Amino acid sequence: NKLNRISRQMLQEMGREPTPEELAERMLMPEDKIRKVLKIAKEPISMETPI
Amino acid sequence: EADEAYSVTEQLTMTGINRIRQKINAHGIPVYLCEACGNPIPEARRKIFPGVTLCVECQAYQERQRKHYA
Amino acid sequence: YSYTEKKRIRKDFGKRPQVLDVPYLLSIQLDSFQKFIEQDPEGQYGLEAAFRSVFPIQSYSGNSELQYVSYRLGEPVFDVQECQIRGVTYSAPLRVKLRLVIYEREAPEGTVKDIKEQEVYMGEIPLMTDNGTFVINGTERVIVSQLHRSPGVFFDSDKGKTHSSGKVLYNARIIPYRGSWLDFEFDPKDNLFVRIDRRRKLPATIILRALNYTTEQILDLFFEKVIFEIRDNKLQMELVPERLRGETASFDIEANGKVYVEKGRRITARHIRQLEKDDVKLIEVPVEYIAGKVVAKDYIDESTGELICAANMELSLDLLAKLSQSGHKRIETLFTNDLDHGPYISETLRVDPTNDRLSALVEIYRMMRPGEPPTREAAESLFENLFFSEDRYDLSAVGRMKFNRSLLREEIEGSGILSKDDIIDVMKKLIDIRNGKGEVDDIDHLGNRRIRSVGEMAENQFRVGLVRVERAVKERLSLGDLDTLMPQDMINAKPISAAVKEFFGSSQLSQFMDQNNPLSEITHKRRISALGPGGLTRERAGFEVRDVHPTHYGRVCPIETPEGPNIGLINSLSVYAQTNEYGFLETPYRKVTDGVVTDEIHYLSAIEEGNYVIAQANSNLDEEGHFVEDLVTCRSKGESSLFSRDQVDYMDVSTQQVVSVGASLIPFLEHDDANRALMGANMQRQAVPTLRADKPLVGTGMERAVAVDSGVTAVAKRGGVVQYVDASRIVIKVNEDEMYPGEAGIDIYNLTKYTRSNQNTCINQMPCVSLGEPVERGDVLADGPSTDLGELALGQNMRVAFMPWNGYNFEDSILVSERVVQEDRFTTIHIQELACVSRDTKLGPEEITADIPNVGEAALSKLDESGIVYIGAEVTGGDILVGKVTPKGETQLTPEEKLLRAIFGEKASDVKDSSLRVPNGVSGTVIDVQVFTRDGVEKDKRALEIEEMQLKQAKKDLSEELQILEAGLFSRIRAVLVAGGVEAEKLDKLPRDRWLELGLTDEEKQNQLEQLAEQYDELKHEFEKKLEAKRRKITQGDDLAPGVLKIVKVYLAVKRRIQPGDKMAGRHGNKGVISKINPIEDMPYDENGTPVDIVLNPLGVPSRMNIGQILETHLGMAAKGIGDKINAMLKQQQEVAKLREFIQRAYDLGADVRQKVDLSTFSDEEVMRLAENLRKGMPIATPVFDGAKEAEIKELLKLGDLPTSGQIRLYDGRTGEQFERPVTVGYMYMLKLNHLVDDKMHARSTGSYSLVTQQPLGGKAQFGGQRFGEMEVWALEAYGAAYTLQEMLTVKSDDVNGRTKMYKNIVDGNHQMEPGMPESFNVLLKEIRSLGINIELEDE
Ligand SMILES: [Zn+2]
């Protein structure tokens, strides 16, 4: 949850969005874990998705 | 391939025109009284159309009426 | 005559003069977008327009309003080239100024404070290229202009098939630009209905009650009043002397002391002439005629105050007495006549369940949203928002125009939403047509079809972008604190940029540019579609809209349309067509005033054109420009016939204006069956660009327009002389006239070199001028692919001869001499992009290291220390392009593998082999390697070498600019210093950098030297920043996806020759697949010994009535003849005299043409260069309908000293003996289309299998086996092929157990099958069994 919010204030603030190592600084933890976090944080995709 | 498409068109066109063509028949000969209403048939219609049975008045009218219901 | 015309001049047949030369072919795409993104200080469509609609946004009446100031477009983040390689979208940041005002409580309005927040960012919006494409992810895309039904109201039929009665029906539809549909329709009972959107049908009068109309006003509005007087005792009636027409007398109708007509005689012209002329106002009547009449208004009893009769209630002989004795003198009734004014609206009221305003407003609310309760506030608001809200409804200006147009109003602009009047007036007009006065529209007419294109459609996607941000802004402005939040806090970026990114990314109208061919690009950007958003659907309509409509003349091409499931659903834009001010389709014509043909041109929209009488393209006018004949074939109101000399109001501009760019490129089109012509301009675009840009011997004249207007070529910005010519770049020293005062300098054109297209063809520019040659503005500076010398050359013409060759051209198959493949001339260069990805898997990270388990040095030769293939290495199938390994530890190998590892000592590795290797069968040269690395992961060795090399090259490029631009600029300083201080030799001794000091005496020349200084120091500094940014962009972390560490893209240049299987075709719809490639020894030759390149079948020509391919062949034959003549005289070195005498004769030919020519061209240095360019053959032009005629062809055959027959005798190269009969030989421009065989050919023994269904599946591009569908099963069922079928859908596919049991048997040399049960059926049993169903296999 914290991660969606940091990107908001910094969405328009940084013209685009903060780099994957920028929100890492905003957040308290090891900050490379963002990748690790962001990977499982995704929901799986509907296998019956039309291509 | 594709050639058949052209072929298809020709057969269709021919059939439509032919029906139309027939609707005029050929060497006919007869009287002059209109079958609907007896009005005078001029020899012009007799000689343009061999076997005419409808006066110019009726040869519109009916045509006209068909159009209206369309 | 110009400069790149002086080089080579196409001999032009065709008599009709060009009065208007072909405009920019990409006009449509470029124009429309320029309008969308641009400051327009007013409302005309654009970003300004979209804003001004939704804005100003205001909080929930809290008097906290957010208004819109103006907007800006930031510079492109990457330019065109840059944005493509990396894979970003080519976009600009949209910065819009917003002003937040707050009103006091409670306020006679005015502000405590307003913060005027500078330009908040709301996403980046894509930008259009110089050549009319977009870049979405480094991939060029086109936005197809769309054709949809014009906004407005249109009255239609639905005759016949309805109900099987005939009768016909009539319906009206109000179609606004945005907001809900308003449909009005009849039925057999002649009841008027309305349905919003496509929803539940409802009785039409309900909307009047929603507009606060009670029963009385509906009668008053749609009906007349028949006033009934009670004068003395029992009933008089007001009689309109006209009312009785289309009816028979109802009683003894008498007035004025004279009985005009008695009961039972129909009121005709006699009776109405009498009444009108005799002025019959009042007549006495019986009390029984109101037995049917409907009373108009409400009448209540003055004493008891009770309702006697409600409005729209029919009186009776007893009902009259109740309101007659109450003292009522008037009773207003309806005039009902089933021929003229039908009792239609009356019947509708009797079907309406509502009565008052809120009664109807509920029935509307409950229809739109059933299931939930109606409310007073809900029902009233819903209706006011549907057709009367500026926000939720708009017809636009065009909608308002066609609305007013179709309704016979005067205003051409007015309300943007519907009014109580608007809706009523439409219902009125609909009734008129059902009465027999008026006709219906048809969807197909191009005055009722409108064209939208990119500029408009992006506007609409931006508008929806704001309405979903507007809800959010209004929501924040409700609770927003005092002077803390500002207009950026509320407006998010993603919501705006997503609503626009959605469109350009995935849409039926945003597609990959069809780019194998400058014609393919230009024919795509000029394209129409009636499909997709807001248009028709393939399953909807319906042959009428697909068919070619008369209004298509000069707007839409009749012949260039796709040949597939959507024929006529696409079409292609005609050459001279342009989009109307209102957005309709108009075409150019010539104003015929009285009997003279002017040259002042007028653009007439589809509606405008019908009225006038337009002459024909091929019409002879001479001297002043009178029509030669007293009667000329013309077309006026939808038909075509002969017309009087001075009745014609206009005339066709060109013989060409009816076709498309594709269609106009076919020579002798007039002689080609329309069907095959379609295939021609359909396949012409599929022409893959050739190795050597040829040129059509047989042309039409358009090829120069298509080459230039398509971006593929490099066209001179400003006229001047060439300073430097490189295969890389071209520098133009500008002439003084065109050269701007400051910055001086030169135009420098950097050329596009060998690079991948969208369809894997190669797009490469080459210089077509030489050092120090004069070029003028708008000259051809460099040819693209499949363009020569400025002309569009989609292929290569060759010597073609029609005859059976032992069956090697049986159907449309083609037979080709070896000389072609030896000459590498239909050889075609393709560029594939293959990429390698280092990912992150659960087990660990992938490394791009060159340490690969169980591979020899034979592999690692083409690989560098880092693991990437070297640039320049010619590799074939199997060679490794990028070494890669994925973490897979503890394999858990088996005994016999373990024993094997122990015998031969392999250190069974803990890493898998995942390297990118070259696909089997394709083979080419590596020409480029890119490496994209995550920001913050260390660039490996080779990656760092590259980003170092990109740096050294970029520094050289930028400095080359400055060196040429300095010397170009300093060279101008030298010349102005000479004007009042000329020290020619003294000046250029000292250092050139030490020149800026020299001044000048009192004059503007002192102020002119001042100008060059500014722009020098600016070159000095603009160089610096242009070099700086360039350097940062290289080293900056290339940003990738989640899970991915670094990516290597290798670009291959495969050079594919031509082999049996390739599809080839001429421009006349003659397809054919090269069948055998023959030795030159075996080719048909003539008595001069020269073999023939292609042997075509004569049978392909009569059936498919494409006779232009023959004319092309003959004219081509004559065109090579002139070539063979000049080649001999040029080798004879005869001298200018003998040469020029012969050339001059060719360009006249017979008399009456349009060509004109020399001897103006400087009778030596210029004339000789031309002769050279013609010796390969003389380029001729056959305009589309202005083409060459047999006589001109035969005449040009005489000059070439070739037979008029077009035929010669030939000799079989094998037996050497003569061929009976003359055969035709000649030159036909022929294309190789990119259905090249070694792309189609697939095969699979055993491959990948799908997880869900154990079924052959394409995974490593060793593609899935062929699909064996239902029909192929009936094939085997019709034979006895019982086993062939079982094996087909058991072991060959579905049988997870059987397939391996078989393969093992196959190699053991036992052809058997141990089938068992397909997993496809095994899953059904489980899938059924997992429902409540017990499905078993019984018995034994
Ligand atoms: Zn008659």
PDB file of N, CA, C and O and ligand atoms in Angstrom, chain B residues 34 37 39 55 58, ligand 1:
ATOM      1  N   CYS B  34     -58.714  -2.165 -76.476  1.00  0.00           N
ATOM      2  CA  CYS B  34     -58.050  -2.440 -75.211  1.00  0.00           C
ATOM      3  C   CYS B  34     -58.836  -3.482 -74.429  1.00  0.00           C
ATOM      4  O   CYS B  34     -60.066  -3.430 -74.359  1.00  0.00           O
ATOM      5  N   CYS B  37     -60.408  -1.626 -71.036  1.00  0.00           N
ATOM      6  CA  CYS B  37     -61.352  -0.515 -71.079  1.00  0.00           C
ATOM      7  C   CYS B  37     -61.739  -0.101 -72.491  1.00  0.00           C
ATOM      8  O   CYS B  37     -62.474   0.878 -72.638  1.00  0.00           O
ATOM      9  N   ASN B  39     -60.259   1.445 -74.976  1.00  0.00           N
ATOM     10  CA  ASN B  39     -59.833   2.683 -75.617  1.00  0.00           C
ATOM     11  C   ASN B  39     -59.080   2.377 -76.917  1.00  0.00           C
ATOM     12  O   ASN B  39     -58.398   1.355 -77.024  1.00  0.00           O
ATOM     13  N   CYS B  55     -53.773  -0.028 -74.058  1.00  0.00           N
ATOM     14  CA  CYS B  55     -53.578   1.358 -74.468  1.00  0.00           C
ATOM     15  C   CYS B  55     -52.508   2.088 -73.645  1.00  0.00           C
ATOM     16  O   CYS B  55     -52.182   1.712 -72.514  1.00  0.00           O
ATOM     17  N   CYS B  58     -53.397   2.760 -70.262  1.00  0.00           N
ATOM     18  CA  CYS B  58     -53.265   1.648 -69.334  1.00  0.00           C
ATOM     19  C   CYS B  58     -51.823   1.166 -69.228  1.00  0.00           C
ATOM     20  O   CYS B  58     -51.500   0.454 -68.271  1.00  0.00           O
TER      21      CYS B  58
HETATM   22 ZN    ZN D   1     -57.263   0.981 -71.932  1.00  0.00          ZN
END
